[PDB]
From Swiss-Prot, chain B:
EC number: 7.1.1.2
Key word tRNA processing present: no
Family: Belongs to the complex I subunit 2 family.
Protein name stated in the entry: NADH-ubiquinone oxidoreductase chain 2
Swiss-Prot record, chain E:
First-listed, main subcellular location of the protein, grouped into a coarse class: mitochondrion
Enzyme class per UniProt: translocase
GO biological process: ATP synthesis coupled electron transport
The species this protein was found in: Sus scrofa (Pig)
Reaction catalyzed: a ubiquinone + NADH + 5 H(+)(in) = a ubiquinol + NAD(+) + 4 H(+)(out)
Family annotation (Pfam families): Oxidored_q2
Subunit: Core subunit of respiratory chain NADH dehydrogenase (Complex I) which is composed of 45 different subunits.
Protein's UniProt name: NADH-ubiquinone oxidoreductase chain 4L
UniProt entry tagged with the keyword Secreted: no
Length: 321, 347, 459, 121, 98, 49
């Protein structure tokens, strides 16, 4: 043992034995600038679950090396502020941002599943890979991205998200678009103040017409308004009194759980199909730029060698490690 | 598949091959072949998908036909001699049946199609085990029955294997199909030297196994199954591409790399027996194998193909699983030419 | 020979362990020291060779080639440090490693005492060269050039391997001394004809022979400066050395089998000089000049007289030095203007005086100007060919005239005339470039002073 | 199979008792040193693949690589030398026992041997 | 050799030709594969009974055992192919190419 | 502390280090003894010393 694998499995570590029937995956969803973050915080703290804030850019930075984020040129090469300012850029920033955000959400979902399977403690994600496509549809129907971008996104999403268990609970916070705009104006951030009304309507249409009907068949779906979402006590009470046996989690066994844990503990296999040789001009990076940026990344302080073997960050006994 | 079931199936495959290699009885040799095939099918079908199912179906059909022909040869040999011991076969018809059956098991031309088809169908681990072990066993049987092999038939099949491997590898783009055609060509070389020096056959087998293990494990490490997927490896782990380049150069037979030693020794041995046309043709035809190795090496290491944007996240993360004996295989497949006279120890 | 082999294998760890800014200094200094040490091999005997051990031996034919290789390494280092300024430290060290490996293989190739060890080493020299070309070349055609070079050489050399193992089975040994003492005449039969063809064709492709030479323009044009320097200076001399070695056992069949190769060499010498007359690319012009000179050397080896062998050796050394110098000069011009076209840059004599002097000296040596060793070798080959037949003088005279024509045409086009008006980035010549040209040219004149050191064993 | 099935051959025996009469390889053998070099190269490649400092990290692992390679190389050299000695022994015995097949020949000097001269001109 | 051995060998050859020439169904090929082992069983027992090789009488039973092991393997592969494609046709096994 | 997560190779596995050093030392001393025994047996069999 000493590391999960086939040896640990034949020794007898079993996920079903580890779980305590309170191990649930709960994902909170909503339109832009809703109370989903605070609702997720409340649910995670009341149920004793681990909270996962929405995976923006630099989530991979937060989970690797030191927690501090990296330069945007080295982590993402995309800008949400620039997307708000000039959505129809000529450098493909919109779809670069969308693909990077999908990869980050996939990585966060893998981390959450690994934590749940290795600990048995439930997790509350502020968004999942199953809700990421709504922003893609909003971009596409507004003309920000292209049909080729949509097709590449669909291919990667297929071959990646087909291998993971869906959330137990999907909590959707329904807020009207004018209220969304009023809250955005009150917040006062200029970049999100540049958001148009047609963009916000497309996200709501994608949630209502595709995501909620799709996830209603799998397991339980709970919808709340702003007032209902404000009172998190009733939401946690509703979660605690959910009866469901039609999900894939009951159908899972120890062998399937072993396979899933082996998949999710290996982050490079998680991201394996995120870099497929589909040469969209938006995401494709030339040989010279790739070489220069990779050289810079290796020149980063604790990135040249493996984590235990970086002398400049204060690792000793390297000659015996 | 449960880990215990997988390891017992692997143990059963190895037990079948060992039964083949230790048995002195034709019935026990056939039993070993049957046990190997029976335990090998689920290993192919481990990762369930229609391609794996089709590959396993084709593999089963081919190996079952070969086993039927081999048992027919055994019975015919028993009819004319009443002997069960595996020695020189006493009937030429039985010997021809046995030769064709073992060639079909090995994948020698014109019984080669199933090799690229199955290799493309199955995963990288399954292909590695297939190529290595399933070449290992029938070659042992052939070495035991070598003294009655029809040189004309054996050399015809070997030369066909070399030509077909070169041409198929020229056309292919998928890495698993490239490896399959490489295997076909190397089997051709081994069986070409087989009627003269079983020691040279064994030496070629060992060098080929080392090179194939190194190459397949590098492909598993980089998680590349196509040429373009391998073209992105320079941006994540550039050392793997350099090692793959030197291994590919070795597999093409370039001196002073390890892949030159089997070709050199086989040519020498064949020329000792007054064979010149066959060694010259065999040496010249390997240039096709070298061409598609070089074409694969241009994309992976010697040139920098465009990369994507999520390769940055891949940079941020580190490889977890450790390949067993990969550095040893890489060294043995490139730097053992000065240790050539150890083939006497192999004798 | 270990006192020269081991310091190269120590150049390897030193290069890999030195600091990021000391790699060029260390490599250059210790390469020069190794060259100085290898100068001691020129003290040869009049009777036999220097038999160091059972594995390595040195002769009057091997010694100058070894000295040329060891002297050529630091010049390649200087040119490489010119054009590889922005490379990473690991890739600089890999480049130096490829150069060091190539030098080690060449040294052991020239000093090998068995034909099979010679074959293994002279085929091992392909891998560093191919990697250098196809990895550090500038243009797109480097990949096709590497493929052409590799497959031409291997298609030539594989029948040589078969013939060598056959000869060992037949006679008992491939040791050069044994096969020289136990040589027997080769009867006129089809089997002997094809053995002769296998060996000779391997080395003729390596030479190259006219009609088997396209890989040479392809590879020399598209390789980096170090690759071009080593390809022309040394790697073309493996074919000549091999032919001067193997023809011991091919007599008397060489008297009858040399006609197609002699006719090909003479006519192709004329043809490649004429091609040089009408070349729009400077590197291609230099490459075809190399083809012409090596055709002359092939003629010398095939006629196979004591006066021709001395000429062959002298011409090989002289061509190595001259072609290396010409490639370096063309590369400096290319680094100025980032193009290989000959008529793009002109007036370089009024913009760069000392480089004009270097161009004049190199072009004068490229044509046979007395008393340079180029002329010594060419004159010996011409005299031996005249004793062979009396129309070879006609062909040689035509070749000399065209050689002078294209050499002076290249000089006049590049240097004289009026400067191109819009080319305003022609900075003054560097001390490094001037020192490189001086180190190319001064040893040639010293060899002219002492010519018995490069005339081979037949002297 | 030339030397397989040789009389008195114990199966599955890496080194028989009759090999103890040969000189063992010297520990400073060039072939043993090359085996050690291969082990060191394997250790360096292991460090490079695992992305540790190539020459610094894992000194114990590199030492184990070198030691294992030298151990197996020593035994391999012993077996190789024994097999070659066996081949020479068998060849000499056969030549001794078949004089009609390997007859001594009268040696003629080059003064008595006639060889054709082919001029080069 | 008597004509009986000729008939048995001819039957084996007919069954071998049947297997190598597919028509549409994979099941028919499996039936041809089972017939080959029946002919092998008959031939081996005819040879053994005639020479009174007493200890060899157990060989045909082992032959039958591995025969039905192969039949089991083929039936399992056939059910997987049928589940994937809807029919046991050999034309559907064409995803992989040479 | 620099890494947000403890690296798997944070501190040397002293069990593995001890096993590695012990295995190397055992193999070396065994090889020396084997070579000495081989030399003695060779000399005894050939009647040299
Ligand atoms: C009986 C007593 C021993 C039992 C040992 C196993 C039980 C304990 C461990 C355990 O639970 O293992 C489960 C584990 C299965 O766990 P899993 O999560 O299903 O992993 C699936 C894949 O292995 C996941 O893929 P992977 O990346 O883990 O691949 C592992 C494996 C995949 O490859 C194989 O399994 C093939 C192994 C044979 C390779 C060919 C060797 C050819 C040698 C020719 C002759 C040379 C002389 O090996 C390789 O990839 C490289 C193999 C290099 C072999 C070098 C041999 C040199 C001699 O079993 C194995 O990994 C294989 C066990 C094989 C046992 C037989 C003896 C070997
Ligand atoms: C095509 C027309 C033709 O025959 O052109 C010959 C002609 C050779 O010059 P030549 O002055 O007419 O030859 C003198 C006598 O005719 C022939 O000389 P000889 O009658 O005094 O006896 C010597 C003859 C003894 O005769 C034989 O050995 C004939 C038996 C078959 C020889 C097969 C040669 C295979 C090896 C070379 C493969 C590549 C070509 O030697 C050869 O045949 C030498 C064979 C190799 C010739 C040159 C190979 C390099 C060609 C480079 C350009 C390729 C484009 O041109 C070529 O061979 C190259 C162009 C055609 C290809
Ligand atoms: C790093 C490794 C070295 C560390 C420093 C030395 C530690 C050990 C000191 C020690 O015990 O010294 C006593 C021992 C003295 O031996 P001895 O008992 O006096 O010799 C008398 C013998 O009874 C009889 O001696 P012999 O003259 O008859 O030798 C027979 C020889 C006859 O062999 C031949 O005639 C043919 C030899 C070549 C065959 C293959 C050619 C084609 C392949 C080329 C290479 C491909 C891969 C690249 O066959 C062999 O030696 C079989 C193996 C062939 C290769 C031998 C290589 C020895 C050095 C091992 C390390 C090489 C590293 C190279 C790269 C370095 C990078 C930093 O010294 C050595 O063995 C030291 C050798 C030199 C070490 C420094 C590296 C030189 C590399 C030269 C490469 C070119 C040649
Ligand atoms: C040293 C001479 C060797 C001669 C040949 C012998 C056989 C090979 C040697 C054994 C293996 C060595 C290690 C291989 C991996 C190295 C990776 C690396 O970065 O290394 C840098 C490493 C130091 O860097 P670091 O800070 O640790 O980490 C930097 C990162 O790795 C930086 O990582 P990165 O991400 O920047 O890496 C990117 C780089 C990564 O590139 C590489 O990793 C290239 C090197 C590995 C490629 C495969 C190596 C050969 C494997 C066997 C194949 C056959 C070899 C023979 C082939 C002959 C025909 C060519 O990729 C590229 O640059 C791609 C573009 C180029 C691709 C095309 C060219 C490929 C050439 C392949 C053949 C090279 C053969 C010569 C060996 C060159 C390396 C030593 O330096 C060395 O390992 C130097 C060698 C060891 C020196 C030991 C000195 C001990 C003390 C003194 C002893 C004195 C003598 C003893 C007697 C006592 C006297 C008193
Ligand atoms: C009192 C009791 C004491 C007992 C002491 C032990 C006695 C020996 C026990 C051996 C181990 C037990 C059996 C386990 C398997 C044994 C395998 C090996 O020992 O057997 C030998 C086999 O040894 C190996 O063949 C030699 C291995 C050589 C490895 C290198 C190959 C050379 C490659 C060339 C380049 C080398 C590059 C450098 C390599 C690192 C000889 O067996 P043999 O019955 O006769 O083989 C029959 C088959 N033949 C006839 C066709 C050959
Ligand atoms: C298409 C047509 C190709 C024609 C070119 C030939 C290249 C293909 C090589 C195939 C072999 C053809 C020639 C075979 C010659 C041969 O085997 O005999 C040579 C002789 C045989 O003697 P024995 O068999 O012992 O007879 C005993 C008599 N009592 O053996 C030898 O001397 C060794 C010769 C090695 C074979 C050489 C074959 C190659 C000949 C030159 C071609 C190479 C040219 C290089 C190509 C570069 C330019 C394209
Ligand atoms: C530390 C890092 C790992 C590398 C370790 C390298 C050394 C390994 C061996 C240690 C010494 C073992 C020993 O005792 O060897 C002695 C033995 C010769 O002794 P013996 O023959 O009995 O006496 C002479 C008789 N005339 O010697 C032998 O038998 C020699 C066999 C081994 C040959 C090895 C060849 C060199 C390998 C590369 C070494 C590079 C070291 C670089 C270290 C860098 C550290 C930063
Ligand atoms: C006959 C045995 C064959 C090998 C069996 C074991 C194979 C699996 C183990 C090696 C896996 C790859 C190497 C890298 C391991 C990285 C993990 C690590 O830290 O390993 C530490 C380990 C030393 O730990 P330790 O448990 O002490 O090992 C000795 C046994 N007590 O350090 C190591 O393991 C590194 C050194 C391993 C030994 C040298 C490499 C193997 C080759 C030995 C010489 C034979 C060469 C020819 C091989 C083919 C022909 C037999
Ligand atoms: N797939 C996506 N594409 C583009 N922008 C996204 C995507 N996912 C999230 N975002 C941006 O990230 C931010 C998420 O925060 P938000 O949903 O507003 O909650 P809060 O109100 O707590 O900030 C929003 O500004 C949104 O525009």
């Amino acid at each position: 043992r000493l590391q999960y694998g086939p040896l640990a499995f034949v020794l007898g570590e079993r996920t079903t034995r580890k779980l305590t029937e309170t191990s649930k995956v709960i994902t909170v969803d909503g339109n832009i600038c809703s109370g989903k973050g605070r609702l997720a915080r409340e649910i995670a703290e009341k149920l004793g679950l681990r909270h996962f804030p929405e995976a923006g850019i630099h989530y991979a930075d937060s989970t690797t090396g030191d927690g501090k984020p990296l330069d945007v040129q080295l982590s993402g090469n995309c800008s949400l502020e620039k997307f708000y300012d000039d959505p129809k850029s000529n450098d493909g920033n919109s779809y670069r941002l969308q693909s990077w955000l999908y990869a980050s959400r996939l990585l966060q979902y893998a981390d959450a599943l690994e934590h749940l399977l290795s600990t048995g403690q439930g997790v509350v994600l502020e968004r999942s890979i199953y809700s990421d496509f709504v922003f893609l549809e909003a971009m596409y129907r507004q003309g920000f991205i292209r049909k080729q971008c949509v097709e590449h996104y669909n291919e990667v999403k297929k071959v990646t998200a087909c291998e993971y268990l869906p959330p137990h609970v999907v909590v959707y916070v329904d807020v009207p678009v004018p209220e969304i705009q009023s809250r955005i104006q009150k917040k006062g951030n200029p970049h999100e103040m540049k958001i148009t009304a047609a963009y916000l309507q497309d996200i709501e249409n994608a949630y209502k017409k595709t995501f909620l009907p799709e996830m209603s068949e799998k397991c339980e779906v709970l919808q709340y308004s702003a007032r209902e979402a404000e009172d998190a006590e009733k939401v946690v009470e509703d979660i605690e009194y959910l009866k469901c046996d039609k999900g894939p989690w009951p159908d899972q066994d120890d062998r399937t759980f072993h396979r899933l844990r082996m998949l999710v503990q290996n982050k490079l296999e998680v991201l394996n199909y995120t870099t497929i040789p589909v040469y969209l001009p938006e995401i494709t990076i030339g040989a010279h730029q790739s070489d220069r940026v990779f050289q810079k990344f290796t020149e980063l302080p604790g990135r040249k060698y493996s984590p235990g073997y970086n002398e400049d960050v204060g690792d000793k006994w390297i000659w015996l490690k | 598949m449960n880990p215990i079931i997988y390891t017992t199936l692997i143990m059963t495959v190895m037990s079948g091959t060992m039964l083949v290699m230790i048995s002195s009885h034709w019935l026990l040799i056939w039993i070993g072949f049957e046990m190997n095939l029976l335990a090998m099918i689920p290993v192919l079908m481990k990762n369930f998908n229609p391609r794996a199912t089709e590959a396993a179906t084709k593999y089963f059909l081919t190996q079952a036909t070969a086993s039927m022909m081999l048992m027919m040869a055994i019975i015919i040999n028993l009819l004319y001699s009443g002997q069960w011991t595996i020695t020189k076969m006493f009937n030429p018809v039985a010997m021809t049946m046995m030769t064709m059956a073992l060639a079909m098991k090995l994948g020698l031309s014109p019984f080669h199609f199933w090799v690229p088809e199955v290799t493309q169908g199955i995963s990288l681990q399954a292909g590695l085990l297939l190529l290595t072990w399933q070449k290992l066993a029938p070659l042992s049987v052939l070495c035991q029955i070598s003294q009655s092999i029809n040189p004309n038939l054996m050399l015809t099949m070997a030369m066909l294997s070399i030509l077909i491997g070169g041409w198929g590898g020229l056309n292919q783009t998928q890495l698993r199909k490239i490896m399959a055609y490489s295997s076909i060509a190397h089997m051709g070389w081994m069986t070409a030297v087989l009627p003269y020096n079983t020691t040279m056959t064994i030496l070629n087998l060992l060098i080929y196994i080392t090179m194939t293990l190194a190459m397949f494990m590098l492909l598993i490490h980089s998680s590349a199954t196509t040429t373009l997927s391998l073209s992105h490896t320079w941006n994540k782990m550039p050392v793997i591409t350099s090692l793959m380049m030197v291994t590919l150069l070795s597999m093409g037979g370039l001196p002073p790399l390890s892949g030159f030693m089997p070709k050199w020794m086989i040519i020498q041995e064949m020329t000792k027996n007054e064979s010149i046309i066959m060694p010259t043709l065999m040496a010249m035809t390997a240039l096709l194998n070298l061409y598609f190795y070089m074409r694969l090496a241009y994309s992976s290491s010697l040139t920098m193909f465009p990369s994507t944007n999520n390769m940055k996240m891949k940079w941020q993360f580190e490889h977890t699983k450790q390949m067993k004996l990969l550095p040893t295989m890489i060294v043995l497949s490139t730097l053992v030419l000065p240790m050539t006279p150890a083939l006497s120890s192999l004798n | 020979m270990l006192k020269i082999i081991i310091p190269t294998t120590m150049l390897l760890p030193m290069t890999w362990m030195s600091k990021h800014n000391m790699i060029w200094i260390n490599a250059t200094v210790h390469s020069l020291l190794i060259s100085l040490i290898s100068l001691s091999l020129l003290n040869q005997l009049g009777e036999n060779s220097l038999n160091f051990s059972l594995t390595f031996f040195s002769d009057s034919l091997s010694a100058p080639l070894l000295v040329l290789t060891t002297w050529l390494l630091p010049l390649m280092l200087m040119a490489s440090q010119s054009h590889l300024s922005k490379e990473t430290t690991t890739r600089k060290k890999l480049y130096i490693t490829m150069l060091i490996l190539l030098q080690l293989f060449l040294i052991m190739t020239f000093t090998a005492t068995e034909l099979i060890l010679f074959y293994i080493l002279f085929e091992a020299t392909l891998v560093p060269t191919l990697i250098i070309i196809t990895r550090w070349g500038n243009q797109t055609e480097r990949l096709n050039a590497g493929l052409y070079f590799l497959f031409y050489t291997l298609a030539g050399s594989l029948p040589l391997l078969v013939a060598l193992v056959y000869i060992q089975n037949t006679t008992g040994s491939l040791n050069f001394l044994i096969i020289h003492y136990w040589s027997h005449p080769l009867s006129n039969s089809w089997s002997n004809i094809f053995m002769w063809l296998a060996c000779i064709m391997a080395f003729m492709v390596k030479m190259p022979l006219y009609g088997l030479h396209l890989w040479l323009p392809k590879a020399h044009v598209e390789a980096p400066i170090a690759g071009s320097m080593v390809l022309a200076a040394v790697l073309l001399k493996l074919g000549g050395y091999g032919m001067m070695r193997i023809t011991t056992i091919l007599n008397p069949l060489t008297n009858y089998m040399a006609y197609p190769f002699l006719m090909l060499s003479m006519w192709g010498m004329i043809m490649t000089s004429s091609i040089c007359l009408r070349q729009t690319d400077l590197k291609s012009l230099i490459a075809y000049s190399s083809v012409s000179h090596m055709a002359l050397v092939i003629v010398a080896i095939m006629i196979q007289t004591p006066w021709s062998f001395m000429g062959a050796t002298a011409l090989m050394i002289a061509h190595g030095l001259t072609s290396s110098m010409l490639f370096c000069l063309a590369n400096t011009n290319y680094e100025r203007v980032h193009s290989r076209t000959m008529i793009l840059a002109r007036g370089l004599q009024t913009l760069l005086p000392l480089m004009a002097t270097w161009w004049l000296v190199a072009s004068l040596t490229n044509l046979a100007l007395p008393p340079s060793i180029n002329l010594i070798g060419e004159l010996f080959i011409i005299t031996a060919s005249f004793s062979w037949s009396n129309i070879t003088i006609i062909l040689m005279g035509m070749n000399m005239m065209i050689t002078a024509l294209y050499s002076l045409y290249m000089l006049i086009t590049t240097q004289r005339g009026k400067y191109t008006h819009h080319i305003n980035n022609i900075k003054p010549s560097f001390t490094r470039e001037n020192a490189l040209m001086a180190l190319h040219i001064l040893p040639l004149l010293l060899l002219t002073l002492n010519p018995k050191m490069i005339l081979g064993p037949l002297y | 199979t030339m030397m397989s099935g040789r009389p008195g051959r114990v199966p599955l025996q890496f080194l028989p008792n009759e090999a103890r009469s040969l000189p063992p390889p010297k520990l400073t053998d060039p072939r043993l040193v090359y085996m050690g070099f291969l082990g060191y190269c394997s250790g360096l490649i292991d460090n490079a693949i695992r992305r540790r400092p190539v020459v610094s990290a894992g000194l114990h692992r590199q030492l184990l690589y070198v030691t294992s390679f030298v151990f197996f190389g020593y035994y391999l050299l012993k077996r190789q030398d024994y097999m070659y000695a066996l081949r020479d022994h068998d060849m000499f015995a056969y030549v001794k026992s078949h004089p009609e097949d390997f007859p001594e020949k009268d040696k003629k000097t080059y003064g008595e041997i006639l060889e054709e001269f082919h001029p080069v001109r | 050799m008597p004509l009986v051995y000729m008939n048995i060998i001819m039957a084996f050859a007919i069954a071998l030709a049947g297997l190598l020439m597919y028509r549409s169904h994979l099941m028919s090929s499996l039936l041809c594969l089972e017939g080959m082992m029946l002919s092998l069983f008959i031939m081996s027992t005819l040879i053994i009974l005639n020479t009174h090789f007493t200890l060899a009488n157990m060989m045909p039973i082992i032959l039958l055992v591995f025969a039905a092991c192969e039949a089991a393997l083929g039936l399992s592969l056939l059910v997987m192919v049928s589940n994937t494609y809807g029919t046991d046709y050999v034309q559907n096994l064409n995803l992989l190419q040479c | 502390k620099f890494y947000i997560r403890e690296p798997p190779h944070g501190s040397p596995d002293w069990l593995k280090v001890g096993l590695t050093l012990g295995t190397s030392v055992f193999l070396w001393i065994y090889l020396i003894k084997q070579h000495k025994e081989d030399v003695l047996e060779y000399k005894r069999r050939n009647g040299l010393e």
